[PDB]
Design a protein around this ligand. Sequence first.
Ligand code: HEM
Ligand code: HEM
Ligand code: HEM
Ligand code: HEM
Lengths: 141, 141, 146, 146
Amino acid sequence: VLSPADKTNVKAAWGKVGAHAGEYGAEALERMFLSFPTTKTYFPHFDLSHGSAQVKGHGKKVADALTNAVAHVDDMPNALSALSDLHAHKLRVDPVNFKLLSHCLLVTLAAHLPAEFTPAVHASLDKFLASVSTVLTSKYR
Amino acid sequence: VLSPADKTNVKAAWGKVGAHAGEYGAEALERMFLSFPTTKTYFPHFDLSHGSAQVKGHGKKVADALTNAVAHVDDMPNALSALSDLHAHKLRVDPVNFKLLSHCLLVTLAAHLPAEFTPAVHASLDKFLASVSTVLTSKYR
Amino acid sequence: VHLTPEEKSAVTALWGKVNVDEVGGEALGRLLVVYPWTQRFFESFGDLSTPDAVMGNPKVKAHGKKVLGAFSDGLAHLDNLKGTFATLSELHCDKLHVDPENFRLLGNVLVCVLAHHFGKEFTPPVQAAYQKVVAGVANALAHKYH
Amino acid sequence: VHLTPEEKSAVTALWGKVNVDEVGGEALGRLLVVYPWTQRFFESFGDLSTPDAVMGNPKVKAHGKKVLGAFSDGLAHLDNLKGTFATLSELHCDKLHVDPENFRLLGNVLVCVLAHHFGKEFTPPVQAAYQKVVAGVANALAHKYH
Ligand code: HEM
Ligand code: HEM
Ligand code: HEM
Ligand code: HEM
């Protein structure tokens, strides 16, 4: 589980993302599509090319969800329950895919937060992202 | 999450294993050692050879532990709190290996309970071991 | 994959006693019940609700004999799995958009299913050899993704 | 591992301007901070109770330097990874008893470090190439486990 410190470092790192959340999510995704091609299968109806408005769009959707989660860091199960139902029942994304996108969020994040991405914060974000995935995966079966 | 239907399926099948926990648990370890060589790195101090008394004994401790877990399917974090600390703070077994041992328990079970291992019980047992891993891995960080 | 000659024999010997019509459909069936999120590539097949709706569905069972069929060609050309499924890889990715990860799940469900089917005959050494086959097979069915 | 001409170029061009003394202790340190269980093989290096302890721990800063040195050594031989690491693979298995799963963890922390260090220059395409490499090096290292 997270800790009083994980939570603060999380709120800390995210407050620094600020208004970039949208372009970081898009980047996060781009990195995921190029690094782990198999993930593309879920986005057949997307133009996965660089700069694409769709990725830029979804990425913002994804970042907003996270921003929401950061602020409900002490109550995620219910703060993202709708999203946990969406990915489990309608989309049905294989779970192994969440660890792939989490790894890219971290990368995108490390590439934009030079002074804040410290060994402790990096440890905090990883646990945070693992928890988000755990929630979004809880309704799978 | 484990439902009252899954619990019934577990309780059921497990009860069917009955006086074989020892034999079955040890077989499962053996299937693991042979099918996943990398898992041996954790028992260098053993004689993983066939029939090995250290495997029979250990297989049996892994066995009883699942029995205790089945007997407290409503309060596993507590029932297993002990093993959680050992594996996390002492052994430090990389999380990936729990899914590997779980898979071998499943074929071990599947090979001894033809009539019981129905698609439904199967589905339930998997979810079950999944949760025992989740509880045994939660004390890592 | 690369199995010792003894592993080769075990897998062939045991595979010869398999009933394509029966095992194939059960494997796929158990995949869907145990790993429901894989049901997305069979929304057309019909009623995939409860276990029986799944196991009973002739479309799922029908498709089962096709996978084992292809699997069979695999053991025939084990010295070259990648070329054997090259075509099936492009189909599952380009036209069908299937996450290679589910091939991994199907591999394990298959092993469980053969163990349930042969019992003690499915010894630890035999399983081990089968794990390699299903692993290689899955790498092959993924080798053309891009 | 095989990388396209563009990928092969990026890897080398970026690695050419890297301080192995720096990136080295940086990676292993974060490996131990983020993946606490990996500390299982370094009780001999001393205090690993906190981020800062592990960070300034000389025993860590130094060995981290060997890892990247070997890593860099393997980059100059991307055409024969399994060959350059054979002795190492055997070492980590027989003597060190290191669970190969840990290598993949070390590969993902490395990419984070390269991204944290180079910033906007660590473009998605570049990460992609490095992902293939670290995956490649990890395979070389687990190649002789048994
Ligand atoms: C923790 C990480 C994730 C979060 C927070 C997340 C968030 C979201 C959100 C908010 C939506 C948008 C719903 C809307 O349009 O109203 C969504 C849709 C979707 N997600 Fe996720 N998701 C995550 C991980 C994944 C992963 C790993 C994949 C697979 C690679 C995935 C695939 C999709 C797909 C294909 C859709 C539907 C896209 C569409 O509307 O066309 N998601 N996700
Ligand atoms: C649900 C699965 C698991 C259960 C129920 C379980 C249970 C146990 C129990 C009860 C002990 C014996 C403690 C004693 O001697 O009193 C133990 C020890 C240990 N476990 Fe696990 N374990 C599980 C999975 C794993 C996995 C996946 C690995 C590694 C691949 C592992 C590695 C170890 C090791 C090496 C020991 C110490 C052995 C020794 O005493 O020399 N365990 N486990
Ligand atoms: C052992 C692995 C697998 C093999 C060897 C395999 C083989 C096949 C074959 C032979 C076809 C027929 C192509 C044709 O002649 O038109 C096919 C189609 C297809 N496969 Fe697979 N498959 C495997 C795993 C999977 C998995 C895991 C899924 C997803 C859950 C999947 C989903 C499909 C779908 C949806 C089709 C098209 C079905 C239809 O609409 O008729 N396959 N597969
Ligand atoms: C990129 C992968 C890695 C490379 C290239 C690598 C390379 C090396 C090298 C060259 C040495 C020193 C050999 C010697 O002087 O005897 C070594 C030793 C060792 N490695 Fe690795 N290694 C890797 C990953 C890991 C990981 C992830 C672990 C486990 C957490 C690990 C644990 C060790 C240990 C404990 C030693 C012995 C160190 C000592 O006691 O002084 N290595 N490794």
